[PDB]
Design a protein around this ligand. Sequence first.
Ligand code: A1BMT
Ligand code: A1BMT
Lengths: 268, 269
Amino acid sequence: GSLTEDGLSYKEKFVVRSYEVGSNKTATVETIANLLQEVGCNHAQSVGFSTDGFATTTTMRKLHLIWVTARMHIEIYKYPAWGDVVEIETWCQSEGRIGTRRDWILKDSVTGEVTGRATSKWVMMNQDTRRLQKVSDDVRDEYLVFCPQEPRLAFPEENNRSLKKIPKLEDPAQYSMIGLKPRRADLDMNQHVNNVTYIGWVLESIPQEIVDTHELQVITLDYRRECQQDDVVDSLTTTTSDSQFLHLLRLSGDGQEINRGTTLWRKK
Amino acid sequence: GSLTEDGLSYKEKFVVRSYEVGSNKTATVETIANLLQEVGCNHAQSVGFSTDGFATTTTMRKLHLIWVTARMHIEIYKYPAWGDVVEIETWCQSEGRIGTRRDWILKDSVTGEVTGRATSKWVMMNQDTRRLQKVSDDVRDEYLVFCPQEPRLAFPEENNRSLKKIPKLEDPAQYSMIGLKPRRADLDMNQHVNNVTYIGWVLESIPQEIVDTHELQVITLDYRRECQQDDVVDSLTTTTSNDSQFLHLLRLSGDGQEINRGTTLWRKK
Ligand SMILES: CC(=O)N1c2ccccc2CC[C@H]1C
Ligand SMILES: CC(=O)N1c2ccccc2CC[C@H]1C
C-alpha cells in the first residue's frame, strides 16, 4: 500500500482469502470491515503516527487522549470473491470541533468499478476516564495537514443513509441472540474488543433464512459504549419493512445499551 | 504464492496485519493457523483441485469423499510482528492407507531463519454418513504425483511431540470456559465450524495470567468430532507440569460428548 501522489489519501490492494468468505464464496461484511480498519492503520503509519496508538497526535499523547469510533456506515454493491483483488482508497477529514470523519472507496482491481463505500465518525476521549470531549484547536492544527482541505465525501447525497438518526428497539424484540461473549481472537492489541465483533454480534440475531436468501446492502452502526472482555451481550432484532431491520446490542444483565443500528438487505 | 520449481511444494508470503496481532504486537497462534490453512488451499488450487471442495480427487467426488483433519501440531520459535513478512512453505505426503500428512515451515522473509513449523494428519471420510475409511489405491494413485516420493518431514526427530498419544482430562478440571458458541465468522464456506476456532476455544480455559507472562511454544490438537453451528462447547484445562504444560479437553455441554483433546507447552518471557 501507499499514499497517493498528494499525500492526502492512501491506497491498498488485498487478495480475498479462503477463510474470509461465506457460503456464496464472497468476502463477508466482517472481512471488509477488518480490511477498512487495516488500511486506516496503514494510512496513519505512512503519515507519521507511531505504533503505540492509533493516529494520536503529539498533544493527544501528553493529554492521554485517543480516537474512538462513534459511528460506522457501510454500503456494498458487490462482495469480492475468494481469489479476487480488492483495492481500497481511504482518507480523513476534519469536522471542526465535533471530531473527525474517515471515508473509504472499494474497487475491483481488475475492472476499476466501485463495489462498495464506507464512512465513519471518530470522536476524542480520555483513555483513562473515558470522557468524550470536543477537539481542541491545537490538536486540530497538528493533523489538518494530512487531510484534504475541500470536502471529499464517499456519501455526498444531501439526505443519505449514513447520517440518519437511529431509534431504540422496543421490547419485545422479534429475533434475538443471547449470551454472546468475546474470546481472545475478538480483542485488539490493546486488549479492547475489536469494533468488527459488534458487527458480527448485530448480525447474529438475523435469522439464517434471511442470510441464505438475501445479501446485505447497507449496515449503519452507532457505538454508545464498549463491551469489556468479561461482559456478556444480547443481540436484538426487529423487521421494520428489500428487508430492513432495527438492531440493539445490550449487556445481558442490566440491559445497558452498547450499540444500536439498522441493516438493509436485497433478494439474490 | 507459487509452487516450487519441482511442483512438489508451495510457497507464499504474508504481511502480518494489525487485527491479526495480540498484546505483544505479534501474530496470534490463530492467525498462524489461518495462514497455514490458506497456503494449503492455494497449494491444492495450484495443482488442479477445484474450488468446489478441498483437495478432492476426481474419484473422491464421485464416491462423495472428503478430507478431514484428524490431528494438528504447531511449534513456534518466534511469532512474526505486525508489519513483518512471513514466508510459509507447505507440502503433502502419502501415509499409505492411513491417510495423508501435510507439513509447513515458517520463515522470516528478511532473515530466512525458520521461526515455526507445523504438521497435520488428514483422513478420508464420507461427506454424507461421516464414516471414516482407509484410502483406496484408486484414490492414492490420483494424488501421489503431487507429493515428494522420498520422506520430507518438518518433524523428523526420533520421538518428537507431534506423534505423542494424548490422554483424556479427568474431572474435575483445574480451569474451565463454559458456554462457548460459534458465530457466523467461525464458519467456513461450507457452513462447518473452522478448525482454527477449536484452537481458540482450547486456549480460552488457559488463565489470562499464564497468557500475559508466557509464550505458547507448542500446541497438539486431536479432532474427534465436529462442533455444529447450534452446539455449545465447554473448554477444560489442567496443568500437567521454567515451562508450563496443560492438558485440554473440548466437550459438548448438552451431554459431555468429546469433540477435541490436546496439550500446550508455554515458556516464560
Ligand atoms: C484518527 C484518524 O484517522 N486520523 C488520521 C489518520 C491517518 C491520516 C490522517 C488522519 C487525520 C488525523 C486523525 C484524525
Ligand atoms: C489433502 C491434501 O492436502 N492433498 C493435497 C493438496 C495439495 C497438493 C497435494 C496434495 C496431495 C493430495 C492430497 C492428499
